[PDB]
Design an enzyme around this catalytic site. Structure first.
Site, mmCIF file in Angstrom:
data_model
loop_
_atom_site.group_PDB
_atom_site.id
_atom_site.type_symbol
_atom_site.label_atom_id
_atom_site.label_comp_id
_atom_site.label_asym_id
_atom_site.label_seq_id
_atom_site.Cartn_x
_atom_site.Cartn_y
_atom_site.Cartn_z
ATOM 1 C CE1 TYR A 181 -2.877 7.919 6.200
ATOM 2 C CE2 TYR A 181 -1.230 9.137 5.151
ATOM 3 C CZ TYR A 181 -1.650 7.958 5.666
ATOM 4 O OH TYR A 181 -0.639 7.276 6.111
ATOM 5 C CG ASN A 184 7.224 7.260 -0.252
ATOM 6 O OD1 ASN A 184 6.266 7.381 -0.687
ATOM 7 N ND2 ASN A 184 8.100 8.095 -0.257
ATOM 8 N NE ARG A 225 5.293 10.478 -2.936
ATOM 9 C CZ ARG A 225 4.698 11.451 -3.457
ATOM 10 N NH1 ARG A 225 5.665 12.484 -4.103
ATOM 11 N NH2 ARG A 225 3.624 11.713 -3.428
ATOM 12 C CB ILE A 273 4.551 -1.972 8.273
ATOM 13 C CG1 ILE A 273 4.766 -0.914 7.099
ATOM 14 C CG2 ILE A 273 5.388 -1.668 9.446
ATOM 15 C CD1 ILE A 273 4.556 0.458 7.481
ATOM 16 C CB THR A 310 2.314 9.315 7.067
ATOM 17 O OG1 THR A 310 2.725 9.404 5.565
ATOM 18 C CG2 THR A 310 1.213 10.259 7.331
ATOM 19 C CE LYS A 319 -1.310 7.832 9.581
ATOM 20 N NZ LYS A 319 -1.133 6.615 10.426
ATOM 21 C CD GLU A 334 -0.182 11.335 2.063
ATOM 22 O OE1 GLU A 334 -0.931 12.257 2.394
ATOM 23 O OE2 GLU A 334 -0.271 10.577 1.351
HETATM 24 N N1 LIG Z 1 4.092 1.504 3.671
HETATM 25 C C1 LIG Z 1 4.392 2.706 3.668
HETATM 26 O O1 LIG Z 1 5.117 3.027 2.781
HETATM 27 C C2 LIG Z 1 3.837 3.854 4.576
HETATM 28 C C3 LIG Z 1 3.952 5.181 4.251
HETATM 29 C C4 LIG Z 1 3.770 6.030 5.120
HETATM 30 C C5 LIG Z 1 2.900 5.692 6.365
HETATM 31 N N2 LIG Z 1 2.538 4.484 6.814
HETATM 32 C C6 LIG Z 1 1.850 4.068 7.923
HETATM 33 O O2 LIG Z 1 2.407 2.934 8.555
HETATM 34 C C7 LIG Z 1 1.181 2.144 9.225
HETATM 35 C C8 LIG Z 1 1.027 0.821 8.690
HETATM 36 O O3 LIG Z 1 0.892 0.906 7.107
HETATM 37 P P1 LIG Z 1 1.001 -0.548 6.188
HETATM 38 O O4 LIG Z 1 2.012 -0.148 5.034
HETATM 39 O O5 LIG Z 1 1.260 -1.907 7.199
HETATM 40 O O6 LIG Z 1 -0.402 -0.717 5.599
HETATM 41 P P2 LIG Z 1 -1.366 -2.135 5.945
HETATM 42 O O7 LIG Z 1 -2.681 -1.668 5.522
HETATM 43 O O8 LIG Z 1 -0.624 -3.228 5.379
HETATM 44 O O9 LIG Z 1 -1.462 -2.344 7.648
HETATM 45 C C9 LIG Z 1 -2.556 -1.954 8.142
HETATM 46 C C10 LIG Z 1 -3.240 -3.163 8.850
HETATM 47 O O10 LIG Z 1 -4.060 -2.571 10.103
HETATM 48 C C11 LIG Z 1 -5.099 -3.224 10.026
HETATM 49 N N3 LIG Z 1 -6.424 -2.358 10.286
HETATM 50 C C12 LIG Z 1 -7.049 -1.203 9.900
HETATM 51 N N4 LIG Z 1 -7.978 -1.047 10.661
HETATM 52 C C13 LIG Z 1 -8.056 -1.803 11.482
HETATM 53 C C14 LIG Z 1 -9.105 -2.140 12.714
HETATM 54 N N5 LIG Z 1 -10.140 -1.322 13.040
HETATM 55 N N6 LIG Z 1 -8.780 -3.087 13.651
HETATM 56 C C15 LIG Z 1 -7.934 -3.838 13.194
HETATM 57 N N7 LIG Z 1 -6.919 -3.839 12.316
HETATM 58 C C16 LIG Z 1 -7.178 -2.965 11.410
HETATM 59 C C17 LIG Z 1 -5.585 -3.557 8.463
HETATM 60 O O11 LIG Z 1 -6.487 -4.638 8.608
HETATM 61 C C18 LIG Z 1 -4.056 -4.066 7.911
HETATM 62 O O12 LIG Z 1 -3.926 -5.371 7.953
HETATM 63 C C19 LIG Z 1 -0.043 3.163 8.916
HETATM 64 O O13 LIG Z 1 -0.498 3.590 9.989
HETATM 65 C C20 LIG Z 1 0.380 4.001 7.643
HETATM 66 O O14 LIG Z 1 -0.272 5.217 7.883
HETATM 67 C C21 LIG Z 1 3.025 3.410 5.709
HETATM 68 O O1 LIG Z 2 -0.274 4.071 -10.478
HETATM 69 C C1 LIG Z 2 0.197 4.897 -9.955
HETATM 70 C C2 LIG Z 2 0.235 5.021 -8.790
HETATM 71 C C3 LIG Z 2 0.924 6.290 -8.254
HETATM 72 N N1 LIG Z 2 1.312 7.135 -8.991
HETATM 73 C C4 LIG Z 2 1.991 8.526 -8.146
HETATM 74 O O2 LIG Z 2 3.168 8.208 -7.658
HETATM 75 C C5 LIG Z 2 3.380 8.697 -6.526
HETATM 76 C C6 LIG Z 2 3.352 7.749 -5.137
HETATM 77 O O3 LIG Z 2 2.032 7.647 -4.681
HETATM 78 P P1 LIG Z 2 1.489 6.667 -3.961
HETATM 79 O O4 LIG Z 2 0.061 6.240 -3.980
HETATM 80 O O5 LIG Z 2 2.498 5.290 -3.660
HETATM 81 O O6 LIG Z 2 1.649 7.191 -2.505
HETATM 82 P P2 LIG Z 2 2.252 8.916 -1.844
HETATM 83 O O7 LIG Z 2 3.534 8.830 -1.818
HETATM 84 O O8 LIG Z 2 1.444 9.731 -3.063
HETATM 85 O O9 LIG Z 2 1.837 8.976 -0.332
HETATM 86 C C7 LIG Z 2 2.081 9.834 -6.268
HETATM 87 O O10 LIG Z 2 2.676 10.954 -6.801
HETATM 88 C C8 LIG Z 2 1.316 9.374 -7.080
HETATM 89 O O11 LIG Z 2 0.407 10.398 -7.672
HETATM 90 C C9 LIG Z 2 1.142 7.391 -10.377
HETATM 91 O O12 LIG Z 2 1.677 7.829 -11.143
HETATM 92 N N2 LIG Z 2 0.462 5.899 -10.762
#
Ligand SMILES: NC(=O)c1ccc[n+]([C@@H]2O[C@H](COP(=O)([O-])OP(=O)(O)OC[C@H]3O[C@@H](n4cnc5c(N)ncnc54)[C@H](O)[C@@H]3O)[C@@H](O)[C@H]2O)c1
Ligand SMILES: O=c1ccn([C@@H]2O[C@H](COP(=O)(O)OP(=O)(O)O)[C@@H](O)[C@H]2O)c(=O)[nH]1
Ligand SMILES: NC(=O)c1ccc[n+]([C@@H]2O[C@H](COP(=O)([O-])OP(=O)(O)OC[C@H]3O[C@@H](n4cnc5c(N)ncnc54)[C@H](O)[C@@H]3O)[C@@H](O)[C@H]2O)c1
Ligand SMILES: O=c1ccn([C@@H]2O[C@H](COP(=O)(O)OP(=O)(O)O)[C@@H](O)[C@H]2O)c(=O)[nH]1
Lengths: 377, 370
Positions: free
Chosen positions: A178, A207, A253, A22, A132, A182, A134
């Site tokens: 997790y 997602n 999802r 992100i 999230t 959160k 979640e």
């Molecule tokens: N991508 C999605 O679909 C999704 C869905 C739900 C929630 N989120 C939330 O969005 C946020 C970002 O997720 P993302 O998809 O970018 O994941 P990501 O892992 O790509 O981004 C997290 C970054 O934070 C850094 N990080 C973790 N611990 C650290 C530390 N101690 N010091 C410095 N950096 C650190 C990692 O090095 C990584 O580059 C998270 O808080 C996650 O919980 C994302």
């Molecule tokens: O190889 C995979 C990876 C994920 N999942 C499932 O697909 C959904 C999406 O999971 P993801 O790990 O992307 O994160 P979530 O939406 O569960 O936070 C969940 O129900 C997982 O159990 C799956 O069937 N096969």
């Protein structure tokens, strides 16, 4: 100029976890479409390396990497005091190790964030914290009998941010490590906004899908690693292996295109009077599928993008004992309510699931395909 | 002389944190009078155990910031952590202090127990379940009568809380996370632990009477609130008409449970335990009525014209209040591991408790009245 109608204040932004999935996309939009200055804090900068001094001097002055690990670093408070707006993305967020590294998960998503919150409140900075979807966990509807008609009433599955409940499994279902962390960070941030005056916004991604999400195992990430479903199926397709469907992939999802989502975040950045206070669902309710369907749709699109046609059986079921391990549980149907984000920022996801998969799988094929062919011999 | 698994009871040094509290105080009386064990009583205040300082050792200590804690832990064989803000009143009013109390301040305790290979008994709460899944089904929908939707089993029922803006869940969410962490620490490393989920333990030294034992404007838990209402002959304030339900267990019954956990680590290590009495269910209206009846018996004096009155939770609790609607503890797990069951009736326990309340507070509130 902003949504309110006022002109746009330019700002220094402290972005923590800025070299993540992100984060990386967030830097793309701030640099290319806004006046703002970014301070990119992360342990690794791989995903933003295309935007930095080593690669180019095209943006430098408006972005600055700082290799920092926020667990223990005094330089953090100064770096925060440097900016006007902190954005905390730094968080372990792959379900794989909620039940396998629960302590590190909790410490990552709750404890390690506390300082960030401390400094924003102390030094009167604005905070955007990424939580999230979640946090809602399971739908109320999930506990009604199979095919009970109340399941059809949106009352039981739509996840409104101001009133839907947070429903998690029992304690032994360690995946909720997790989510619970959160949840608590949200209650704390909100509390800090209440007990003292912290200007904040909380983001609940549903997602988010796109380029640069997680890693392909055995190429740019550990062979034994297990990412989120996009990456998992991406790997399965690239190696011409069927797609592993966890307990028959019947959970649902809603995927939103990464680019659509970033627009949302930007609006929050540039309209603090409509975002301060609030919690926001960022997801695309129209792109709902089961996991089986995601799999089918991805193999179809992949075949289009790749040239090659599909497999004899392109998917296969596998137990979550086999796949995820011991204390796995799952959210069953995430459907984001749009009312609040729509009313406050006027945001809507333009992009289709099919369209976004076409885009994303082309990036995946372009990037990983030769590499995965050379690692098969 | 002997545990459940037949073996003899080795005497133990017990570090009890929050030992001068309601539960702590009764726990000390039991350990002292009915067992060989040594108690180290850690708390900031000792008021409720002061009668027992004439095998116990008070230490005025505040676990937020105090180096001598790790040594005090390393002193004992078993740590019992009761120390926690646990009055609903200030879940929505002091949410930060609540979270820090119930999650953050406990972390060190957990650190030391795992490092130094001590056993930990952590007190969580029935609030961890929060709301019943049944609560979301339509008014008078029959699925509400199916225990499937209200009985709270510890290994499988879900944790259901309100949205974030419902700040009362501050407390529950913090308790939830400490449980997941303790359980995790038992998994990722080898921590011997037991978790206790009290369902509304009732008895003698619970909380405080306002304007006598504690602040006049203070707001305790329902026992104390109604106790005060009765002592002053005011009507009992019923929050949004007191239609939520609860299950009260007698403090003495509950302590027996805790004792079994202490003396049978073989059956308690690993597990999470509901300690409540499912037979003593009432609505809050009913608790109120029942208490006025019993009180009239205990006091001499009869009831009043309208002995209760409704009041809004905006008026009473403040801004972000929400509520668990129906706690009914399961008990298969505790009943099959320790053989525990609550002997004592609601009416019986209220008779007992209100006699203690009248004996103690009645002349004091007559003095302060004038
Ligand atoms: N991508 C999605 O679909 C999704 C869905 C739900 C929630 N989120 C939330 O969005 C946020 C970002 O997720 P993302 O998809 O970018 O994941 P990501 O892992 O790509 O981004 C997290 C970054 O934070 C850094 N990080 C973790 N611990 C650290 C530390 N101690 N010091 C410095 N950096 C650190 C990692 O090095 C990584 O580059 C998270 O808080 C996650 O919980 C994302
Ligand atoms: O190889 C995979 C990876 C994920 N999942 C499932 O697909 C959904 C999406 O999971 P993801 O790990 O992307 O994160 P979530 O939406 O569960 O936070 C969940 O129900 C997982 O159990 C799956 O069937 N096969
Ligand atoms: N009373 C109930 O029926 C009930 C119901 C559900 C859960 N619980 C849980 O049981 C535990 C004890 O409940 P209780 O009714 O004895 O509460 P209590 O307040 O009577 O006892 C807690 C004690 O811990 C002490 N304490 C708090 N912070 C401290 C610190 N920093 N250092 C030292 N001591 C500190 C308090 O001073 C108090 O004496 C709590 O963990 C509570 O969450 C109780
Ligand atoms: O003077 C009072 C005190 C409490 N309550 C209600 O009684 C129940 C018990 O609240 P308590 O503070 O005892 O503990 P909880 O069960 O809320 O943890 C809750 O429904 C309260 O809202 C009430 O109606 N009047």
């Amino acid at each position: 100029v902003d949504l309110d109608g006022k002109p746009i204040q330019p700002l220094t932004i402290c972005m923590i976890g800025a070299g993540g999935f992100i984060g990386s996309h967030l830097c793309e939009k701030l640099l290319t479409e806004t006046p703002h200055k970014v301070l990119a804090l992360d342990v690794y900068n791989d995903k933003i390396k295309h935007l930095l001094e080593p690669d180019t001097v095209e943006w430098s002055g408006r972005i600055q990497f700082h290799r920092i690990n926020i667990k223990h670093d005094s330089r953090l408070e100064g770096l925060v005091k440097m900016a006007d707006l902190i954005i905390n993305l730094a968080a372990i967020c792959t379900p794989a190790d909620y039940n396998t590294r629960p302590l590190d998960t909790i410490y990552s998503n709750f404890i390690d964030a506390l300082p960030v919150v401390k400094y924003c409140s102390e030094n009167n900075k604005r905070l955007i914290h990424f939580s999230t979807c979640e946090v809602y966990g399971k739908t109320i509807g999930s506990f009604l009998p199979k095919d009970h008609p109340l399941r059809d009433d949106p009352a039981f599955y739509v996840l409104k941010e101001d009133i839907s409940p947070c429903i998690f499994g029992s304690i032994e279902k360690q995946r909720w490590s997790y989510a619970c962390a959160k949840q608590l960070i949200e209650r704390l941030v909100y509390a800090e906004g209440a007990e003292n005056g912290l200007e904040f916004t909380i983001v609940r991604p549903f997602n988010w899908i796109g380029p640069r999400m997680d890693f392909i195992p055995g190429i740019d990430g550990p062979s034994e690693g297990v990412p989120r479903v996009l990456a998992c199926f991406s790997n399965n397709l690239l190696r011409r292996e069927p797609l592993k469907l966890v307990d028959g992939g019947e959970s649902q999802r809603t995927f939103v295109y990464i680019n659509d989502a970033i627009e949302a975040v930007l609006l929050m950045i540039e309209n603090p009077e409509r975002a301060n206070g609030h919690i926001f669902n960022v997801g695309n309710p129209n792109n709902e599928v089961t996991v089986r369907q995601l799999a089918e749709m991805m193999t179809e699109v992949y075949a289009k993008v790749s040239g090659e046609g599909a497999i004899e059986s392109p998917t296969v079921d596998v137990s979550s004992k086999e796949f995820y391990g011991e204390g796995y549980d799952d959210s069953d149907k995430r459907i984001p309510d749009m009312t609040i984000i729509n009313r406050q920022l006027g945001w809507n996801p333009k992009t289709s699931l099919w369209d976004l998969l076409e885009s994303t799988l082309t990036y995946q094929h372009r990037t990983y395909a030769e590499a995965v062919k050379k690692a098969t011999s």
